[PDB]
Design an enzyme around this catalytic site. Structure first.
Site, PDB file in Angstrom:
ATOM      1  N   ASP A 127       0.830  -1.200   0.000  1.00 47.99           N
ATOM      2  CA  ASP A 127       0.000   0.000   0.000  1.00 47.99           C
ATOM      3  C   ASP A 127       0.867   1.254   0.000  1.00 47.99           C
ATOM      4  O   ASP A 127       0.759   2.100   0.887  1.00 47.99           O
ATOM      5  CB  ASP A 127      -0.956   0.014   1.196  1.00 47.99           C
ATOM      6  CG  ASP A 127      -2.024   1.091   1.076  1.00 47.99           C
ATOM      7  OD1 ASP A 127      -2.304   1.532  -0.061  1.00 47.99           O
ATOM      8  OD2 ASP A 127      -2.589   1.496   2.114  1.00 47.99           O
ATOM      9  N   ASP A 151       5.142   2.082   7.638  1.00 48.12           N
ATOM     10  CA  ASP A 151       4.195   0.970   7.612  1.00 48.12           C
ATOM     11  C   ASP A 151       4.447  -0.003   6.464  1.00 48.12           C
ATOM     12  O   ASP A 151       3.521  -0.376   5.744  1.00 48.12           O
ATOM     13  CB  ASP A 151       2.765   1.502   7.535  1.00 48.12           C
ATOM     14  CG  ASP A 151       2.330   2.183   8.817  1.00 48.12           C
ATOM     15  OD1 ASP A 151       3.058   2.071   9.825  1.00 48.12           O
ATOM     16  OD2 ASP A 151       1.258   2.826   8.820  1.00 48.12           O
ATOM     17  N   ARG A 197       0.432   9.051   1.698  1.00 45.66           N
ATOM     18  CA  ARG A 197      -0.074   8.999   3.081  1.00 45.66           C
ATOM     19  C   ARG A 197       0.883   8.159   3.935  1.00 45.66           C
ATOM     20  O   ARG A 197       0.949   8.401   5.092  1.00 45.66           O
ATOM     21  CB  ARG A 197      -1.516   8.488   3.088  1.00 45.66           C
ATOM     22  CG  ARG A 197      -1.817   7.381   4.078  1.00 45.66           C
ATOM     23  CD  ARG A 197      -2.301   8.046   5.330  1.00 45.66           C
ATOM     24  NE  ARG A 197      -2.807   7.147   6.324  1.00 45.66           N
ATOM     25  CZ  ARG A 197      -2.125   6.664   7.324  1.00 45.66           C
ATOM     26  NH1 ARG A 197      -1.014   5.997   7.116  1.00 45.66           N
ATOM     27  NH2 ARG A 197      -2.594   6.802   8.542  1.00 45.66           N
ATOM     28  N   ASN A 198       1.601   7.227   3.317  1.00 44.46           N
ATOM     29  CA  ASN A 198       2.498   6.339   4.045  1.00 44.46           C
ATOM     30  C   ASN A 198       3.971   6.698   3.865  1.00 44.46           C
ATOM     31  O   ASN A 198       4.855   5.887   4.143  1.00 44.46           O
ATOM     32  CB  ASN A 198       2.258   4.892   3.619  1.00 44.46           C
ATOM     33  CG  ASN A 198       0.951   4.338   4.155  1.00 44.46           C
ATOM     34  OD1 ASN A 198       0.566   4.620   5.291  1.00 44.46           O
ATOM     35  ND2 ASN A 198       0.258   3.554   3.337  1.00 44.46           N
TER      36      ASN A 198
HETATM   37  C1  90F Z   1       7.429  11.827  15.959  1.00 43.11           C
HETATM   38  C2  90F Z   1       7.186  13.259  15.476  1.00 43.11           C
HETATM   39  C3  90F Z   1       5.738  13.356  15.004  1.00 43.11           C
HETATM   40  O1  90F Z   1       4.877  13.797  15.766  1.00 43.11           O
HETATM   41  N1  90F Z   1       5.552  12.897  13.746  1.00 43.11           N
HETATM   42  C4  90F Z   1       4.351  12.861  13.152  1.00 43.11           C
HETATM   43  C5  90F Z   1       3.234  13.614  13.507  1.00 43.11           C
HETATM   44  C6  90F Z   1       2.046  13.465  12.798  1.00 43.11           C
HETATM   45  N2  90F Z   1       0.968  14.184  13.134  1.00 43.11           N
HETATM   46  C7  90F Z   1      -0.298  13.965  12.396  1.00 43.11           C
HETATM   47  C8  90F Z   1      -1.090  15.242  12.221  1.00 43.11           C
HETATM   48  C9  90F Z   1      -1.212  15.958  13.550  1.00 43.11           C
HETATM   49  N3  90F Z   1      -2.105  17.117  13.422  1.00 43.11           N
HETATM   50  C10 90F Z   1      -2.232  17.805  14.715  1.00 43.11           C
HETATM   51  C11 90F Z   1      -3.194  18.979  14.594  1.00 43.11           C
HETATM   52  O2  90F Z   1      -4.486  18.501  14.166  1.00 43.11           O
HETATM   53  C12 90F Z   1      -4.388  17.851  12.885  1.00 43.11           C
HETATM   54  C13 90F Z   1      -3.437  16.669  12.988  1.00 43.11           C
HETATM   55  C14 90F Z   1       0.174  16.384  14.000  1.00 43.11           C
HETATM   56  C15 90F Z   1       1.044  15.161  14.246  1.00 43.11           C
HETATM   57  C16 90F Z   1       1.961  12.577  11.730  1.00 43.11           C
HETATM   58  C17 90F Z   1       3.067  11.823  11.367  1.00 43.11           C
HETATM   59  F1  90F Z   1       2.987  10.976  10.353  1.00 43.11           F
HETATM   60  C18 90F Z   1       4.240  11.966  12.095  1.00 43.11           C
HETATM   61  N4  90F Z   1       5.314  11.270  11.733  1.00 43.11           N
HETATM   62  C19 90F Z   1       5.617  10.073  12.242  1.00 43.11           C
HETATM   63  N5  90F Z   1       6.864   9.849  12.650  1.00 43.11           N
HETATM   64  N6  90F Z   1       6.976   8.755  13.043  1.00 43.11           N
HETATM   65  C20 90F Z   1       5.821   8.101  12.934  1.00 43.11           C
HETATM   66  C21 90F Z   1       5.499   6.853  13.254  1.00 43.11           C
HETATM   67  C22 90F Z   1       4.210   6.397  13.042  1.00 43.11           C
HETATM   68  C23 90F Z   1       3.269   7.257  12.499  1.00 43.11           C
HETATM   69  O3  90F Z   1       2.014   6.744  12.305  1.00 43.11           O
HETATM   70  C24 90F Z   1       0.857   7.576  12.106  1.00 43.11           C
HETATM   71  C25 90F Z   1      -0.398   6.722  12.331  1.00 43.11           C
HETATM   72  C26 90F Z   1       0.790   8.180  10.835  1.00 43.11           C
HETATM   73  C27 90F Z   1       0.181   9.432  10.774  1.00 43.11           C
HETATM   74 CL1  90F Z   1      -0.435  10.156  12.208  1.00 43.11          CL
HETATM   75  C28 90F Z   1       0.059  10.113   9.569  1.00 43.11           C
HETATM   76  N7  90F Z   1       0.549   9.543   8.396  1.00 43.11           N
HETATM   77  C29 90F Z   1       1.164   8.292   8.450  1.00 43.11           C
HETATM   78  C30 90F Z   1       1.280   7.603   9.652  1.00 43.11           C
HETATM   79 CL2  90F Z   1       2.052   6.052   9.585  1.00 43.11          CL
HETATM   80  C31 90F Z   1       3.665   8.559  12.181  1.00 43.11           C
HETATM   81  C32 90F Z   1       4.928   8.942  12.411  1.00 43.11           C
END
Ligand code: 90F
Length: 300
Positions: free
Chosen positions: A160, A178, A164-165
């Site tokens: 996949d 992933d 997004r990944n």
């Molecule tokens: C470790 C530093 C960090 O926080 N990184 C981070 C924040 C996020 N988010 C998601 C959006 C989120 N906002 C906050 C404000 O409201 C809207 C969402 C902010 C934090 C998403 C990421 F993919 C990441 N990047 C990731 N780094 N390491 C990961 C390990 C697993 C992981 O899995 C989650 C389910 C994920 C997410 Cl959340 C989004 N796209 C792919 C994946 Cl695989 C993401 C990260």
């Protein structure tokens, strides 16, 4: 009660759980602070991502996370993937600790950095100049290809691959995420739309969608879709086409159109990635070399 692996085991008390990042089919991800991930600096703080089971976890959910954990152990370390940092398996809940990518996934990265339209009042010498430039877009595509090339050498199929990944670090390094997930390929709801509106079926190779066959070449197909995402700046593939229509169109050999402001070189690569015969699609090694030529030719 899982067997102790001193190579990867990390003291859970050295973790401080923080804000949840997201949840997936069998696990949720939480941002956390880690102290002494580098054993040479025991009191040094670092930001990591911790994957764990939900509170409605079944024995199957545990098996999938354990399976994912072991995959991340075997594959090894590469700059363009999310690397395993440690695990917590003793005297407490199962934790899978992996690298952080500060900027989130590639899709949201691009969509948040689209250029301003002619309704912005010109302010400054760069009011028409957006965060994203062509050589950086090519770099993003190149890095994902190199990461996929690495995963291929480790006999790992993503199944996949999508924007997004793909995760983005503070230095805009692409990290594939992933890649070791059990995705239940024998029971895919092809009509299932994610909470963010994604239809994962639009990333599936024909042999995967129709014949349930996955190879590294099926990932190449997905990479082509990912290429389209990049140069649409986070657009959704097959625009305005519902799954039912996608089925018949794919059977008719339909392919996506060339996106605006996309050079023929890159749409050429996309169409090559979408060749019906998997053997007529480029390998990831070839994609890396092809994208490298473009990147070098635009990086003076
Ligand atoms: C470790 C530093 C960090 O926080 N990184 C981070 C924040 C996020 N988010 C998601 C959006 C989120 N906002 C906050 C404000 O409201 C809207 C969402 C902010 C934090 C998403 C990421 F993919 C990441 N990047 C990731 N780094 N390491 C990961 C390990 C697993 C992981 O899995 C989650 C389910 C994920 C997410 Cl959340 C989004 N796209 C792919 C994946 Cl695989 C993401 C990260």
């Amino acid at each position: 009660d899982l067997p102790l692996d001193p190579l990867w085991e990390f003291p859970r008390d050295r973790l401080v759980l923080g804000k949840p990042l997201g949840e997936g089919a069998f696990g949720q991800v939480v941002r956390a602070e880690a102290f002494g991930m580098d054993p040479a600096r025991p009191d040094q703080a670092s930001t990591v991502a911790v994957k764990m089971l939900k509170d409605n976890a079944s024995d199957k959910d545990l098996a999938d996370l354990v399976s994912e954990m072991e995959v991340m152990k075997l594959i090894g370390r590469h700059k363009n993937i999310i690397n395993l940092l440690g695990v917590c398996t003793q005297e407490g809940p199962l934790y899978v600790i992996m690298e952080c990518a500060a900027k989130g996934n590639l899709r949201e990265f691009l969509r948040a950095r689209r250029p301003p339209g002619p309704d912005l009042s010109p302010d400054g010498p760069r009011s028409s100049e957006g965060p994203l430039s062509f050589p950086v877009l090519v770099s993003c595509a190149y890095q994902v290809a190199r990461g996929m090339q690495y995963l291929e050498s480790r006999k790992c199929i993503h199944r996949d691959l999508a924007a997004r990944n793909v995760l983005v670090t503070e230095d805009n390094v692409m990290k594939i995420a992933d890649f070791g997930l059990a995705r239940g390929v024998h029971h895919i709801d092809y009509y299932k739309k994610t909470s963010n509106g994604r239809l994962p079926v639009k990333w599936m190779a024909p042999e995967a969608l129709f014949d349930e066959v996955y190879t590294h070449q099926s990932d190449v197909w997905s990479f082509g879709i990912l290429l389209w995402e990049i140069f649409t700046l986070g657009g959704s593939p097959y625009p305005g086409i519902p799954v039912e229509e996608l089925f018949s169109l794919l059977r008719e050999g339909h392919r996506m159109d060339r996106p605006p402001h996309c050079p023929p070189e890159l749409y050429g690569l996309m169409r090559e990635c979408w060749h019906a015969a998997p053997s007529q699609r480029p390998t990831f090694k070839q994609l890396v070399e092809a994208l490298d030529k473009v990147l070098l030719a635009v990086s003076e």
